């Protein structure tokens, strides 16, 4: 017979689950400078090896269940760390599972043609040569949620056989002949233009740098269209020019190629000057008629909007350039204009 209540033990569940999720999905992705090496356990010397980032320990106390409690506010240390290099990357998860789940995996894939000149070209009768080159660099053609230097680990890729497939519309011979004749005049000539329509250039920035100057010599700016810029981690954009670039010891996202930029909130101001004397928007258009003040931190004249630290001029410029919105009152643009890479969809104020 038992006297009194039954012996039993207690445990908080929801708090424990929250701690587990928070630790697992954030605290392990802090910048390495906050983690410390273990005790009595041998670790890899190379910091890019999977082993180093796996056996490196990070204290749970940095991010416990009570971090910025009650507040919607991304951590400081993480907003510079790439967020796509994360084992919860839905697309990366899908692709990795689609290939399989083992270490050794045969594959049979179909690669499209992306070069804009021939991407949608309507090839006519004749005998045409067609040759292309393919990389076998694991660090380049593979993606890893941790970005570790794969070729140091021992990832390898080998091609067995490559074939070309093309589908012909079984067009009636008479109409096909008429179309072929009509498409070889001097007038009915096909045309194309690259969708980005750009001219990428890149500029190094030293560590702990604040200002970045830039110059272009006496060009001719005819039919110029506009600017577009962002910021990348040098440890990641890869040197496209040669073949194997030995030095690409990182295997995560490639914001120069994947289009997944994440360092866009680190810009402060932009100044544009033609002939070293005139400022381009400098017809007293903006509130600060010489700079595109993006985020002014200290200054409190009352120029920031959206209950954040982006200035009114910069917000107006972004909205105008993306959706022609701003001269007749701000309002959420339609989903049909705000694509996934559009400005508004990724604008997240915090406090």
């Amino acid at each position: 017979i038992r006297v009194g209540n039954n012996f039993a033990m207690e445990i908080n569940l929801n708090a424990n689950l929250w701690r587990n999720f928070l630790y697992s999905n954030i605290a392990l992705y802090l910048p390495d400078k906050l983690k410390y090496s273990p005790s009595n356990v041998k670790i890899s010397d190379n910091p890019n090896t999977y082993d180093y980032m796996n056996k490196r320990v990070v204290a749970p106390g940095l991010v416990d269940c009570y971090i910025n409690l009650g507040a919607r506010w991304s951590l400081d240390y993480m907003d510079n760390v790439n967020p796509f290099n994360h084992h919860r990357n839905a697309g990366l998860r899908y692709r990795s599972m689609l290939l399989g789940n083992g270490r050794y995996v045969p594959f049979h894939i179909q690669v499209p043609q992306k070069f804009f000149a021939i991407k949608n070209l309507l090839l006519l009768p004749g005998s045409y040569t067609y040759e292309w080159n393919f990389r076998k660099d694991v660090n380049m053609v593979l993606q890893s949620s941790l970005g570790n230097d794969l070729r140091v680990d021992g990832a390898s890729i080998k091609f067995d056989s490559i074939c070309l497939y093309a589908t012909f519309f079984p067009m009636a011979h008479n109409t096909a002949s008429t179309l072929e004749a009509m498409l070889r005049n001097d007038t009915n000539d096909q045309s194309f233009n690259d969708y980005l329509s750009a001219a990428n250039m890149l500029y190094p920035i030293p560590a702990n740098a604040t200002n970045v100057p830039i110059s272009i010599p006496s060009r001719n700016w005819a039919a110029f269209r506009g600017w577009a810029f962002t910021r990348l981690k040098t440890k990641e954009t890869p040197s496209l020019g040669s073949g194997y670039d030995p030095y690409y010891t990182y295997s995560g996202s490639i914001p120069y190629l994947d289009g997944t930029f994440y360092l866009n909130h680190t810009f402060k101001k932009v100044a544009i000057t033609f002939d070293s004397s005139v400022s381009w928007p400098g017809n007293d258009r903006l509130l600060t008629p010489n700079e595109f003040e993006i985020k002014r931190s200290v200054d409190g004249e009352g120029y920031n909007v959206a209950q954040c630290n982006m200035t009114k001029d910069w917000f107006l410029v972004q909205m105008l350039a993306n959706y022609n919105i701003g001269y007749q009152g701000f309002y959420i643009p339609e989903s049909y204009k705000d694509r996934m890479y559009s400005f508004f969809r990724n604008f997240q104020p915090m406090s």
Partner: protein
């Protein structure tokens, strides 16, 4: 009740996006070929440009990527069977020496 004194911090994030500064008089997208790109002050005589970016400090070395948006057109022509001749062009930052 025993709350400590407060301070406020505000920041923002904007990922997967490129900051845009269209080369137009009123910043609006009134066409593929912006009006300011047709001005005689710019379409006729030469000019030189200096820019300046002030950016936050980061421990890792980083690179600024500026993408001067420019026209980039290809025209494909085919006089006879098995003959492809193309004419490329990238007007503002023209590429290619001639003769």
């Amino acid at each position: 009740k025993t709350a400590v004194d407060s301070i406020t911090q505000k920041k923002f994030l904007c990922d997967r996006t490129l900051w845009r500064i269209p080369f137009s008089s009123n910043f609006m997208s009134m066409g593929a070929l912006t009006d300011l790109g047709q001005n005689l002050l710019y379409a006729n005589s030469a000019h030189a440009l200096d820019m300046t970016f002030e950016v936050d400090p980061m421990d890792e070395p980083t690179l600024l990527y500026v993408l001067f948006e420019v026209f980039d057109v290809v025209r494909v022509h085919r006089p006879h069977r098995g003959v492809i001749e193309t004419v490329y062009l990238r007007t503002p930052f023209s590429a290619g020496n001639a003769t």
